[PDB]
């Protein structure tokens, strides 16, 4: 009674990362709309340096545990 036009079910065929799917690729996901990917935060670890007590610049009895980047 009216020209059939594509519906949500029809349009979701062309939504997967690959269209003709496979067992290998079933775990793939569509790429993000903008190229940015929500990546797990990188926990930036900074070196820990004693800097004493036995240090020429530590006045003899300081354990100034330093957290350094570079």
């Amino acid at each position: 009674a009216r020209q059939w036009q594509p519906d949500i079910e029809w349009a979701e065929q062309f939504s997967g990362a690959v269209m003709y799917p496979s067992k290998e690729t079933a775990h793939w996901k569509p790429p993000p709309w903008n190229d940015v990917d929500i990546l797990k935060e990188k926990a930036v670890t900074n070196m820990t340096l004693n800097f004493g007590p036995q240090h020429p610049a530590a006045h003899g009895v300081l354990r100034l545990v330093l957290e350094l980047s570079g």
């Binding site: 594509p6 790429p31 990917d37």
Partner: protein, 344 residues
């Protein structure tokens, strides 16, 4: 980027291929190739996102390896013949190595897996530049040594490229990957004819560029980077639909459009040289391209996919992006078959 950096990098990108084409010395041609690689890398890594860095690293590794093998070919030729240009008596293995490495640079299958990822991980304008301009410098060198190339190896690369690109384009649902695989297929076609008549290779390269550039401009018009995204064209920008359809069909190769002339003339020459088996296989397998283009046409122009409410607001705004070159190149790439004799 600031104006100075833009000017310098774009000048280097323009210079590279110019140096390669205008240089006689093979090493200066290699210098042109190196210029192109180094200058393109930053433009690729402009967006500074993980995908951009991934693609840039892949491109750099692959291209650097290929360029080193090319330089080996040049150096061994120097040892053999005391000169800096391949001569008629250069060793077949040296020439085959040059052929391999230029194939890997260009993206021909089997040396093709790198290309689709690089095209997927980068913006559309850089996709255009990479899939068009960066192919000029490598093809020039081969055109300069077409008498010497091995038809067996070149036809293996051509047939494999056609088959792999045609098969690959079917599955992909990403526009950039689709363009990459179309590039691989058309590259198989360009290389198939190089041993026999290089002018047809140039013809096909120009047809491919005139067909591809406007497609990338059309995609950029709305950043439509997926089949679903392009499906909303009928609402976001309706007028462009006719060109998108006709240009896709032309790239497929349906006769009445320009995109036929490359395949037709290439088959003509190949059969003139008695390459019937290869020509028939290539012509057969160059139809899956038409299939996975017809699917895009179905999705965009011949049906109306479900649309989005917010597009109502888009309808209110005004847009100014379609340049004059889109119109000119689209018409020139779809309605120029009648003038074919002048092109060949």
């Amino acid at each position: 980027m600031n104006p100075i950096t833009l000017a310098i990098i774009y000048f280097t990108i323009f210079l590279g291929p110019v140096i390669t084409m205008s240089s006689t010395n093979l090493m200066l041609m290699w210098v042109g190739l190196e210029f192109s690689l180094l200058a393109i890398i930053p433009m690729l890594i402009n967006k500074k996102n993980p995908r951009s860095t991934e693609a840039a690293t892949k491109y750099f590794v692959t291209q650097a390896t290929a360029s080193m093998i090319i330089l080996l070919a040049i150096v061994l030729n120097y040892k053999q013949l005391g000169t800096w240009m391949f001569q008629q008596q250069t060793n077949g293995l040296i020439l085959n190595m040059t052929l391999m490495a230029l194939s890997m640079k260009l993206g021909l299958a089997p040396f093709h897996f790198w290309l689709p990822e690089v095209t997927q991980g980068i913006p559309l304008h850089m996709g255009l530049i990479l899939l068009t301009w960066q192919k000029i410098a490598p093809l020039s060198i081969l055109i300069q040594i077409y008498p010497l190339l091995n038809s067996t190896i070149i036809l293996m690369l051509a047939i494999t490229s056609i088959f792999m690109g045609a098969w690959g384009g079917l599955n992909q649902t990403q526009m950039r990957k689709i363009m990459a695989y179309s590039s691989i297929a058309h590259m198989g076609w360009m290389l198939a004819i190089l041993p026999y008549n290089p002018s047809l290779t140039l013809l096909n390269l120009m047809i491919y560029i005139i067909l591809t550039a406007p497609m990338f401009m059309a995609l950029m018009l709305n950043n439509s980077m997926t089949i679903n995204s392009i499906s909303l064209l009928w609402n976001k920008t309706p007028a462009m639909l006719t060109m998108i359809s006709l240009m896709l069909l032309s790239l497929g190769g349906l006769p009445p459009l320009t995109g036929f002339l490359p395949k037709w003339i290439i088959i003509t020459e190949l059969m003139k040289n008695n390459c019937l088996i290869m020509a028939t296989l290539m012509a057969m397998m160059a139809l899956l391209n038409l299939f996975f283009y017809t699917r895009l046409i179905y999705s965009t122009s011949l049906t109306m996919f479900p649309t989005n409410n917010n597009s109502k607001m888009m309808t209110h705004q005004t847009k100014t992006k379609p340049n004059l070159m889109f119109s000119t190149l689209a018409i020139m790439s779809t309605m120029t078959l009648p003038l074919a004799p002048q092109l060949i």
